[PDB]
Amino acid sequence: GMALAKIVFASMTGNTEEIADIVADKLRDLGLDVDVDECTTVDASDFLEADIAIVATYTYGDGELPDEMMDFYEDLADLNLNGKIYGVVGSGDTFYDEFCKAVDDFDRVFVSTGAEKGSECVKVDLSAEEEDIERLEQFAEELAAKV
């Protein structure tokens, strides 16, 4: 394939899963091999094997990580991912005044590992509309371009 992308997601009410899937589908159409897994089913260290690492996450309450993301975040923060390209996407809402703060938190943890951000993070309000789909597709196409 063009390269190997590993997308890890957390999703409570399905929006973030759907977003992960949109990104995965464009990457597959561009010729990459892609794995798409819920965060409870993989290890952060599996990222060592990939060329592109992506986290798709919702945000829980007052700007927290998903409960199920806490262990994955810890494991990821302890890795050295020099030479990997990353990106971060997610769904959120404004009810807790911390819209997609988990997306920002995962951007920072990736910076700390030495990986390089390949495209601007994509934050979606609740479910994806076609305008959000376009943004996600441009994100995937920019990562593909960088290889």
Describe what this molecule looks like in 3D.
With 147 residues, the protein is α/β, with parallel strands linked by helices. The protein has a single domain (1-147), classed as Flavodoxin domain (Rossmann fold), CATH 3.40.50. It is 35% helix and 21% strand. It has four helices and six strands; from the N terminus they run βαββαβαββα. It has helices at residues 15-29, 70-77, 101-112, 130-146, and strands spanning 4-9, 33-38, 52-56, 85-92, 116-117, 122-125. Strands 1, 2, 3, 4, 5 and 6 form a six-stranded parallel beta sheet that branches. α1 packs across α4 (130-146). The longest helix has 17 residues, at 130-146. The radius of gyration is 14 Å and the shape is globular. This is Flavodoxin. Residues 5-144 form the Flavodoxin-like domain. Keywords: Electron transport, Flavoprotein, FMN, Transport.
Structural class: alpha/beta
Highest-level CATH class = Alpha Beta
Shape designation = globular
Oligomer designation: monomer
CATH topology: Rossmann fold
Element-by-element helix/strand order: EHEEHEHEEH
Q: Quick one: how many beta strands?
A: 6
SS summary, helix count: 4
CATH architecture assignment name: 3-Layer(aba) Sandwich
CATH homology superfamily: Flavodoxin domain
| Rounded Rg | 14 Å
How many angstroms separate the termini? 11 Å
User: What is the helix fraction of residues, given as a range?
Assistant: 25-40%
Strand content: 15-25%
